[PDB]
Design a protein around this ligand. Structure first.
Ligand SMILES: CNC(=O)CN1C[C@]2(CCN(c3cncc4ccc(Cl)cc34)C2=O)c2cc(Cl)ccc2C1=O
Ligand SMILES: CNC(=O)CN1C[C@]2(CCN(c3cncc4ccc(Cl)cc34)C2=O)c2cc(Cl)ccc2C1=O
Ligand SMILES: [Cl-]
Lengths: 305, 305
């Protein structure tokens, strides 16, 4: 029993974190095999950030301008290239701690663990989700760039995020491990703002199924809804539209609890209208949206209470 | 910016987790140097759990009755002894991944990271606190016994908790690494219940300082209070008494924000007497009490390990 915001064990990722320095800029890098991946803005000063010409800044660099530190050992850079917003530094030592890994680009609503790092050293691990407006509500200070997001289903680490910046509202933006940004952001200090964010509906429904699995049904009602009527109501509360894909994905949780997806949708509609009336659901007074259907199945018992 | 429930990086602990099996009971063990620490109830069957005589059950066991598995390697048990509610299995191989460590007993209100394990394999990491009633609100399923709680200070892991059981309300109970229970609990299947819990006042105040640091100030007011008058309010809402030690401990956060501790106590009194009026603090509609003053300072400073 219990339901916590649970992160994957971070050990496989801790053994890949390094410090990358180019001149006066220092940030984190990810060392996998003989390559160190890091944000390309490591070659920028604060002045360069308004309109950086990365190709022009990079051509003026040699391999020995990049200092890579793994623990107390200095790695030697023997090659460099840029791929989108990521800089790839070829080093003369393959990481002996390289886990089995994949680079995966995730969609909004998907969750992942973040290993926050400073100066190539891990400080903490937390769970979060890619918001519908492609930002993440992380906890990052200056020096955290290059920190990564990942999932570890089975023994393989799937790297999905690399940290690049903090927007004016305090939320965060970054790229996949191929250097493609999530959302309409650029690695430039220009007027950029997070779009209006919405609640991840399929995740709230999954978390309501987690509450039922753990023994709570106070919020259920005798009603059902059509998918279209649910979306007309949900959109009024800034909730993401629920698609047939989302209804299909909730199938297993629906069968484990005996509650049809559209019947759980009717319960969500009523909760939006009424609030919780002093009650909590899994220790929260708000409707939680950072647990996916897959996360609930991973954490919860297969036997409903 | 941002404020997340953050756990310590778990890698140093992942390298210590093993599987311990005695007959039909399988659980997790902690392998440090040439000793495996695990709950003594591994020697019990379901029938024995009703009323066990642990010395009598243990005397009937030989070293070969304990199967210890570290990854895919079988460790050979060469000795065994009991210390309170923990079984210590002497093995013929010292753990090459043993980190610098200490066994420490924590007090209620203190937080720690839990590395939830099943069959000697880590599945997740989450942060939690020792409640005033000596239980923890964890997330544990059958097979999680032997999972440990810890903190990190520089390179030293301080092990503070070992998981033993779940109470009828879904909360959890366990021991320090010397086998002494936290709380008036016993390691047997008998009528046991968590006592009435209270809110960790110094932690709520620390989290209000974290909200101020992050730009959330709507709850601040021009008023102050005395420690005696605030304690009269705290007792009425099932909040733990605030002491002069707690006021001293909040000193640094008070200086970083310019808000006196009794000034923040007057804000908490108003939140207790009036609620939040539809507003949230750090994305929560409840007053959060599982972040200590030290946790707030560490997360708002980027301390690494
Ligand atoms: C809040 N940002 C700033 O005032 C200056 N700023 C620097 C920077 C690089 C570092 N960084 C941060 C990344 N995460 C957490 C941060 C927390 C506090 C600060 Cl001040 C900075 C953080 C940025 O956002 C950046 C990188 C890129 Cl690709 C594009 C733009 C910027 C940028 O605008
Ligand atoms: C809820 N527990 C039970 O019905 C049976 N139960 C078994 C047990 C050992 C395993 N364990 C669990 C530990 N964490 C999460 C659990 C989640 C679901 C279950 Cl069914 C068990 C869990 C216990 O609590 C135990 C150990 C000790 Cl030292 C003293 C008593 C017990 C005990 O009463
Ligand atoms: Cl995805």
């Amino acid at each position: 029993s219990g339901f916590r915001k649970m992160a994957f064990p971070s050990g496989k990722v801790e053994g890949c974190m390094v410090q990358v320095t180019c001149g006066t800029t220092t940030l984190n890098g990810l060392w996998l095999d003989d390559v160190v991946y890091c944000p390309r803005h490591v070659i920028c000063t604060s002045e360069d950030m308004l309109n950086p010409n990365y190709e022009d800044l990079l051509i003026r660099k040699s391999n020995h301008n990049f200092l890579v530190q793994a623990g107390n050992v200095q790695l030697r850079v023997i090659g460099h290239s840029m791929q989108n917003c990521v800089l790839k530094l070829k080093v003369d030592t393959a990481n002996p701690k390289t886990p089995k890994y994949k680079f995966v680009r995730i969609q909004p609503g998907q969750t992942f663990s973040v290993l926050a790092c400073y100066n190539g050293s891990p400080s903490g691990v937390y769970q979060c989700a890619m918001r519908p407006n492609f930002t993440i509500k992380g906890s990052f200070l200056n020096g955290s760039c290059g920190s990564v997001g990942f999932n570890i289903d089975y023994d393989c680490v799937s790297f999905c995020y690399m940290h690049h910046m903090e927007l004016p509202t305090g939320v965060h933006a970054g790229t996949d491990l191929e250097g493609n940004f999530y959302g309409p952001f650029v690695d430039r200090q220009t007027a950029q703002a997070a779009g209006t964010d919405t609640t991840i509906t399929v995740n709230v429904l999954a978390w309501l199924y987690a509450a039922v699995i753990n023994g709570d049904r106070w919020f259920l009602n005798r009603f059902t809804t059509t998918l279209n009527d649910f979306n007309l109501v949900a959109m009024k509360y800034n909730y993401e539209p629920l698609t047939q894909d989302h209804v299909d994905i909730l199938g297993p949780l629906s069968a484990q609890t005996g509650i049809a997806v559209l019947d759980m949708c009717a319960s969500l509609k009523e909760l939006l209208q009424n609030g919780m009336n002093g009650r909590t659901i899994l220790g929260s007074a708000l409707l939680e949206d950072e647990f996916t259907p897959f996360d609930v199945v991973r954490q919860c018992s297969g036997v409903t209470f």
